[PDB]
Amino acid sequence: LSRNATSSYFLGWQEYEKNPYHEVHNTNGIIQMGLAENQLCFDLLESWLAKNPEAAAFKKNGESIFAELALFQDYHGLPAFKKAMVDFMAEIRGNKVTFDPNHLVLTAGATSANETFIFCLADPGEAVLIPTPYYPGFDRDLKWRTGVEIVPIHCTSSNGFQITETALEEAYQEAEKRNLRVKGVLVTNPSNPLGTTMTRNELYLLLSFVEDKGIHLISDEIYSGTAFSSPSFISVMEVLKDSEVWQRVHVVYSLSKDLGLPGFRVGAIYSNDDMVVAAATKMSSFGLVSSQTQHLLSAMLSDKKLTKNYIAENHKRLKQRQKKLVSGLQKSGISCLNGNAGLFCWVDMRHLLRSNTFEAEMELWKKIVYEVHLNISPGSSCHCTEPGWFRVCFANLPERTLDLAMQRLKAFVGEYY
Amino acid sequence: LSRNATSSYFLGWQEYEKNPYHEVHNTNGIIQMGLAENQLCFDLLESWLAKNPEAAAFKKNGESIFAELALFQDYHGLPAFKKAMVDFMAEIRGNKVTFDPNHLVLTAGATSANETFIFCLADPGEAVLIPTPYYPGFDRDLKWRTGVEIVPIHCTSSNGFQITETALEEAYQEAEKRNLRVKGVLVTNPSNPLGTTMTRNELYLLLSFVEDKGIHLISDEIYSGTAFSSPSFISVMEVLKDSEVWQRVHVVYSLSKDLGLPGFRVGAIYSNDDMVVAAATKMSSFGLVSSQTQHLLSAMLSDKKLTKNYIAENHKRLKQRQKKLVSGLQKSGISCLNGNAGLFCWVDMRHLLRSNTFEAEMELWKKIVYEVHLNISPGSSCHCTEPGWFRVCFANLPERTLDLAMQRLKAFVGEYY
Numbered sequence: 153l154s155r156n157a158t159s160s161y162f163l164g165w166q167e168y169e170k171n172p173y174h175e176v177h178n179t180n181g182i183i184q185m186g187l188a189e190n191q192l193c194f195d196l197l198e199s200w201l202a203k204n205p206e207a208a209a210f211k212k213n214g215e216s217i218f219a220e221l222a223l224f225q226d227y228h229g230l231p232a233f234k235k236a237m238v239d240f241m242a243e244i245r246g247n248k249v250t251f252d253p254n255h256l257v258l259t260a261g262a263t264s265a266n267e268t269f270i271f272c273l274a275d276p277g278e279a280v281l282i283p284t285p286y287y288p289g290f291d292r293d294l295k296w297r298t299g300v301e302i303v304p305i306h307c308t309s310s311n312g313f314q315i316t317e318t319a320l321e322e323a324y325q326e327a328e329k330r331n332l333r334v335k336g337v338l339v340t341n342p343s344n345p346l347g348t349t350m351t352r353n354e355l356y357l358l359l360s361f362v363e364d365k366g367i368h369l370i371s372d373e374i375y376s377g378t379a380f381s382s383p384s385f386i387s388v389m390e391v392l393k394d395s396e397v398w399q400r401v402h403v404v405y406s407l408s409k410d411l412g413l414p415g416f417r418v419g420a421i422y423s424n425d426d427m428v429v430a431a432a433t434k435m436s437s438f439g440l441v442s443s444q445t446q447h448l449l450s451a452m453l454s455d456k457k458l459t460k461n462y463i464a465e466n467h468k469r470l471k472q473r474q475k476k477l478v479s480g481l482q483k484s485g486i487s488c489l490n491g492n493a494g495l496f497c498w499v500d501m502r503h504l505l506r507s508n509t510f511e512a513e514m515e516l517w518k519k520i521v522y523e524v525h526l527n528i529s530p531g532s533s534c535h536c537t538e539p540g541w542f543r544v545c546f547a548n549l550p551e552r553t554l555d556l557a558m559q560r561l562k563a564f565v566g567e568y569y
Numbered sequence: 570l571s572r573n574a575t576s577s578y579f580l581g582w583q584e585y586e587k588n589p590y591h592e593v594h595n596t597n598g599i600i601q602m603g604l605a606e607n608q609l610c611f612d613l614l615e616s617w618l619a620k621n622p623e624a625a626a627f628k629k630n631g632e633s634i635f636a637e638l639a640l641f642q643d644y645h646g647l648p649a650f651k652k653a654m655v656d657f658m659a660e661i662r663g664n665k666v667t668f669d670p671n672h673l674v675l676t677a678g679a680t681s682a683n684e685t686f687i688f689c690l691a692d693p694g695e696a697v698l699i700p701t702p703y704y705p706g707f708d709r710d711l712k713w714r715t716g717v718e719i720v721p722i723h724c725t726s727s728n729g730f731q732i733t734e735t736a737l738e739e740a741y742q743e744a745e746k747r748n749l750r751v752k753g754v755l756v757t758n759p760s761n762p763l764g765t766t767m768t769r770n771e772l773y774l775l776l777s778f779v780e781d782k783g784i785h786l787i788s789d790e791i792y793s794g795t796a797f798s799s800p801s802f803i804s805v806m807e808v809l810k811d812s813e814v815w816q817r818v819h820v821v822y823s824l825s826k827d828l829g830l831p832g833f834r835v836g837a838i839y840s841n842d843d844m845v846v847a848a849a850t851k852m853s854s855f856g857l858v859s860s861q862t863q864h865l866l867s868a869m870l871s872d873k874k875l876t877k878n879y880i881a882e883n884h885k886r887l888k889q890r891q892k893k894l895v896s897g898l899q900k901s902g903i904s905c906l907n908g909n910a911g912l913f914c915w916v917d918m919r920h921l922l923r924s925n926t927f928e929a930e931m932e933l934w935k936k937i938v939y940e941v942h943l944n945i946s947p948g949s950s951c952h953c954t955e956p957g958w959f960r961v962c963f964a965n966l967p968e969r970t971l972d973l974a975m976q977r978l979k980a981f982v983g984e985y986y
């Protein structure tokens with residue numbers, strides 16, 4: 153084959169499938185708390201669909217448009233869907249910001265949109281700065297086929313894993329050291345795996361740093377609609393609304409996490425740079441969104457009654473579900489980073505480490521997966537600077553199963569501590 | 570931006586949108602005969618859908634499976650859909666060959682599957698051999714992000730644009746000359762833009778050549794279901810059915826052309842090499858097929874009554890439509906390559922060239938688009954070795970519009986010749 157053709161986050165995931173938990177067929181199975189999915193609000197969608205069958209019937213205004221959709225492969229995207237998307241994104245941001253649909257580019261999921269953005273701004277050998285801890289999938293998405301390098305901006309629990317001027321300069325000094333040409337910074341807001349919204353000061357800090365370095369800022373806002381608690385979610389685009397730096401600020405979105413439709417593969421890129429758009433637009437040809445899905449979500453995201461109620465009901469259920477995990481953890485004497493967003497909790501299990509090393513982290517992880525039968529993501533998998541932290545997903549399973557996981561966890565700790 | 574971020578086939582296409590033809594709003598518009606789309610058999614699908622609403626209703630065996638689909642993002646693909654796909658591909662090949670679903674990899678269209686295959690077999694700087702003329706989109710799909718080079722295997726009208734032992738060695742000698750490492754040959758069977766099925770002798774010739782060079786063979790069989798006339802379509806996989814070369818034979822498929830659903834973005838890769846599959850599989854994450862589309866086509870492609878009737882009715886309508894273009898052309902004294910497949914005719918307009926040059930070809934093309942108001946693909950756009958040839962699509966428009974195009978063409982020739 154070729155070079156391109158030739159961790160724990162992916163292993164635990166594969167182990168889960170080798171022996172998945174089932175409330176009837178396999179009660180001693182592995183419980184999956186390692187995938188950030190949101191299955192809480194399906195009933196609201198399932199209900200709406202069964203009563204609004206026209207979208208799925210390839211019909212518009214009553215008349216069939218099956219032929220038009222079957223042929224639609226325009227890499228510019230279905231216009232009705234792009235408008236519905238930019239309004240939904242505006243609604244999530246309290247309508248404090250507005251997006252132009254001619255500047256929105258659809259992609260098959262955010263996995264496809266992040267890689268695409270890398271291909272547009274960084275040539276092989278070049279580099280991007282990314283705050284750690286970060287989504288484990290980034291190592292694959294952003295590097296495998298682009299040949300670009302990620303230089304970590306380290307963050308510690310000292311200041312709640314926030315981004316500091318110190319970390320930024322330090323990460324950039326590491327780039328210059330390795331003679332790597334830094335093309336930009338890619339941040340996740342709200343943060344995965346932290347489950348925290350970025351503060352306005354962090355945002356201004358990023359905007360200033362990339363203004364002094366003449367580089368790009370990419371904000372992965374896929375969890376923007378999962379901000380179920382104060383403070384408020386602040387889009388990087390809102391911070392620009394209060395010279396030439398805005399042409400270097402970009403947004404990556406997806407309907408995978410707030411709507412819980414990762415299977416439909418709807419992602420997007422939004423940039424103010426007319427050039428980035430045109431190039432990203434052309435690249436979407438490699439991963440367009442099914443026109444069938446575009447038309448369906450175009451009808452759903454157009455029902456302002458459905459979206460207003462969905463957002464409010466999702467925040468509510470997320471918050472309730474989050475407290476149930478926190479309390480379940482507090483029950484075993486385990487604390488979490490104070491999070492107000494995401495579909496997971498960044499958990500502090502340092503006090504359970506044999507030693508302050510990653511080797512010890514690994515060991516604790518193995519036991520949890522092979523003994524407690526729970527799949528969670530270790531912090532080294534997220535490139536966290538300090539051992540002991542784990543990401544635990546709480547919205548990808550039934551409440552009762554969540555309780556079960558907690559019990560198996562309480563037993564374990566009260567079984568070795 | 571970056572290097573990656575920074576012809577006539579694409580221009581004529583853009584001109585068409587700047588002034589598209591319309592049988593009511595714009596009769597002097599440009600007629601599109603440059604896009605190989607099949608709108609002939611939509612009625613059969615549209616009809617089936619309106620009477621089998623469950624697929625589009627996210628329901629299986631009566632029960633809702635909306636939640637399961639919404640969450641399905643497995644890069645291994647929905648199993649029911651993969652089985653339905655491998656049987657449909659088997660049916661198109663007269664069930665003379667069988668495909669294993671664990672060896673089939675889904676991608677968002679064949680555009681996504683061809684690039685992916687390039688990333689798996691060729692490292693940047695390396696090369697692939699491709700018979701000309703070939704699909705203009707290949708220059709973008711296979712080279713833009715892979716950095717791989719295409720070395721043309723020239724074919725002339727002398728022997729009906731078939732592939733000869735001479736052309737193969739010659740193309741390979743050109744590679745060695747440019748110190749390019751040849752990784753394989755990528756062929757289109759049936760051929761685009763020729764609209765001809767590959768003969769068994771050509772297939773054996775390719776299998777032998779790649780066996781002597783120790784390289785891979787990729788067969789783009791996206792038009793396999795558009796073989797509406799004798800001789801029969803012969804899959805490269807059938808030729809292998811009558812030592813270690815089969816592990817280097819691969820197939821690229823799509824539902825864009827036989828089913829006429831380019832908008833749904835369903836593509837696939839099939840290889841016998843367990844290693845290629847696993848790697849292609851991982852790469853599909855960048856362009857997965859919407860689970861909604863997978864489930865819909867899983868029901869449709871499972872109705873053996875629908876598929877048997879669709880295939881037979883499609884061949885029939887294609888053949889009838891093809892003769893209508895040939896006769897329309899013969900009417901202006903224009904001949905075509907004797908084609909038995911595809912959604913287009915490879916037309917000989919050499920006798921209309923001011924001179925035997927491409928400059929003259931360009932000139933004839935400009936006039937046709939700007940004067941006759943017809944969009945067709947010139948042969949240089951396909952990297953044809955001899956000027957004067959044009960690809961004309963006949964299945965992407967209403968019969969009456971097709972007649973109109975013919976009239977405007979007859980007038981033109983009888984207006985300058």
Ligand SMILES: *CC[C@H](NCc1c(COP(=O)(O)O)cnc(C)c1O)C(=O)O
Nearest residue numbers: 187188261262263287344372406408414
């Ligand atoms: C649901 C997986 C979750 N996060 C994934 C993810 C993506 C991929 O999303 P998609 O749109 O479905 O391709 C892109 N960006 C980020 C920042 C994340 O987290 C997880 O398990 O972490």
Ligand SMILES: *CC[C@H](NCc1c(COP(=O)(O)O)cnc(C)c1O)C(=O)O
Nearest residue numbers: 604605678679680704761789823825831
């Ligand atoms: C319908 C366009 C037609 N051929 C396209 C094409 C593709 C892309 O197909 P998709 O599956 O929709 O991404 C891939 N391979 C080949 C060989 C062709 O021709 C055209 O206008 O030529």
Ligand SMILES: [K+]
Nearest residue numbers: 260440677857
């Ligand atoms: K897709």
Ligand code: NI
Nearest residue numbers: 226227228229
């Ligand atoms: Ni367009």
Ligand code: NI
Nearest residue numbers: 252254255426
């Ligand atoms: Ni603009």
Ligand code: NI
Nearest residue numbers: 643644645646
């Ligand atoms: Ni899988």
Ligand code: NI
Nearest residue numbers: 669671672843
């Ligand atoms: Ni096998």
